[PDB]
């Protein structure tokens, strides 16, 4: 399993206490494992990593010019937040208005891998669907990955409904990430075009 195509992949990690400190390490390990199966490079697969709570912290930006090994190290060091809330709406907003404020590589496909393990208060979801529709308009594919029993299933189904390629992966716990990893990498790689 190795992806050598034109793709901008954004990893969005749920920073809530729905994942324990140790389960969060397993999530970070999945992110590093995914990076190892992607041709990390500005010319091939660029990557971004954001941990989101009520607000979010970007550890790697798509434009960061660093060796793939240093990017894997940064991912492995993302700090555990353990917040009461991890707003999927705010992080999709951040992705739409900040990460993709401009579309720098129209030759690459763009994917937001939304790793979800919790459910935000309803008031935080007010613009949810508008953020998902805004992403669709800029051709940013949203791939929700539900983890655990507190994952917001309503939001996972709403994302799939907004665009045909927004396929969801619903997992019982972070332990399943390792098992489904190659399958996910494969589905994401196929959404991207080959270099010329």
């Amino acid at each position: 399993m190795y992806c050598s195509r034109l793709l901008d992949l954004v990893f969005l990690l749920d920073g809530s206490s729905r994942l324990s400190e140790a389960e969060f390490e397993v999530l970070k390990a999945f992110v590093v494992d995914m990076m190892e199966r992607l041709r990390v490079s500005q010319k091939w697969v660029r990557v971004a990593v954001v941990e989101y709570h009520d607000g979010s912290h970007a550890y790697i930006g798509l434009k960061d010019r660093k060796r793939p090994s240093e990017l894997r190290r940064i991912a492995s060091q993302v700090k555990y937040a353990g917040s009461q809330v991890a707003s999927t709406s705010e992080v999709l907003k951040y992705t739409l208005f900040q990460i993709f404020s401009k579309i720098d590589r129209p030759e690459a496909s763009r994917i937001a891998l939304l790793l979800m393990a919790s459910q935000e208060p309803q008031r935080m979801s007010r613009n949810f669907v508008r953020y998902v529709q805004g992403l669709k308009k800029k051709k940013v594919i949203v791939i929700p990955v539900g983890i655990g029993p507190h994952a917001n299933l309503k939001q996972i189904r709403l994302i799939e409904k907004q665009a045909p390629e927004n396929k969801a992966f619903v997992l019982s716990s972070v332990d399943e990430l390792e098992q489904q990893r190659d399958e996910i990498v494969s589905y994401l790689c196929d959404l991207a075009p080959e270099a010329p």
Partner: antibody
Amino acid sequence: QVQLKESGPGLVAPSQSLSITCTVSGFSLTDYGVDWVRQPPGKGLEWLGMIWGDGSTDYNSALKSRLSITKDNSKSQVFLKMNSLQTDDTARYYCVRDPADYGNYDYALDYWGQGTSVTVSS
Amino acid sequence: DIQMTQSPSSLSASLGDRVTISCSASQDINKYLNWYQQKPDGAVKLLIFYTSSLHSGVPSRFSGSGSGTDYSLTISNLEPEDIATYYCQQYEKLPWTFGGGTKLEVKR
């Protein structure tokens, strides 16, 4: 039939609080939101805030953090409380239902209570 | 806050007339516009939501249209029970805000 009705105190002395209970029927507060809207005598409508099915809330910041909306799902009641009223808070206060359906971005004020008149004076 | 303007606060008409009430927002509101009716006795009811959908019970003589900043509520044939004040309201962004109202009056 969807219904909402306000029980207010009628009068509030300047600097005191306003408490109003909205009692609803015909739907469950767990599946709908409830908003509060007010109308000063001879003037238009002002949206004040609302409470979602899950109890989370949205408030109009023009109220300067003076407003609280809470509820009791099992008693079909929604409670408005506002700190330190002044004469310009004199108005008729309405509780109004809204679908609070973010999946469909649908928040219309679809069924209104008749309203309760509040006068702030010493 | 987004400002909603109803240019005519008082609109005269004869029963049987086609009446149009206009509303405009200070910025694009993406058709997130609702219309309400307040009768002389104070009762408020929702008439039109999301620019053009009729609420339950509302008769077809009421219709709404528009996009961008400009919206209109049309009453195809004015009936006595329609003498009331009409308000538009936006939900493009919190806090929700209402137009200043348009009160219909009967000509004589």
